[PDB]
Design a protein around this nucleic acid. Structure first.
Ligand SMILES: [Zn+2]
Ligand SMILES: [Zn+2]
Ligand SMILES: [Zn+2]
Ligand SMILES: [Zn+2]
Length: 119
DNA sequence: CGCGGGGGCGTCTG
DNA sequence: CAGACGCCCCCGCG
């Protein structure tokens, strides 16, 4: 089970062996969302299973909003919110309804999900 | 009702 | 592995 292990996983819940550095880099991605960090704040006590999740969450406390709109100059702290809001200025509404008499279009999957719950 | 704003998660690239 | 991009999901508000 380890008589030949060019590489191993660095996650303490795994520590299994691998042979291709890249194929192990791919395996490791599964564990990148299994590392329980915690907030550093004295006004928080949350835990995040990824560095990016914690780093994103930190912005909620710092108030930092580096993603600024080119149109209305609004400021956001998540690229997903900014790109979503971008579609509001771009008129990009690809989430059209599939019901037998509607086809109403939204710029967000969840907006379409709520709309469908109205049917 | 349209959209802000946080949670969780897969994933390519570095 | 981590940093960064993209989405789905859920909730709250004017
Ligand atoms: Zn592993
Ligand atoms: Zn926090
Ligand atoms: Zn804008
Ligand atoms: Zn519909």
């Amino acid at each position: 089970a380890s008589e030949k292990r060019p590489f191993m996983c660095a996650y303490p819940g795994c520590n299994k062996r691998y042979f291709k550095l890249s194929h192990l880099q791919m395996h490791s991605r599964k564990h990148t969302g299994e590392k329980p960090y915690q907030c550093d704040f004295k006004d928080c006590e949350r835990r995040f299973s990824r560095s990016d999740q914690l780093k994103r969450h930190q912005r909620r406390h710092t108030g930092v909003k580096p993603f600024q709109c080119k149109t209305c100059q609004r400021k956001f702290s998540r690229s997903d919110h900014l790109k979503t809001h971008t579609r509001t200025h771009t008129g990009e509404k690809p989430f059209s309804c599939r019901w037998p008499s509607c086809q109403k279009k939204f710029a967000r999957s969840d907006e379409l999900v709520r709309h469908h719950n109205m049917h």
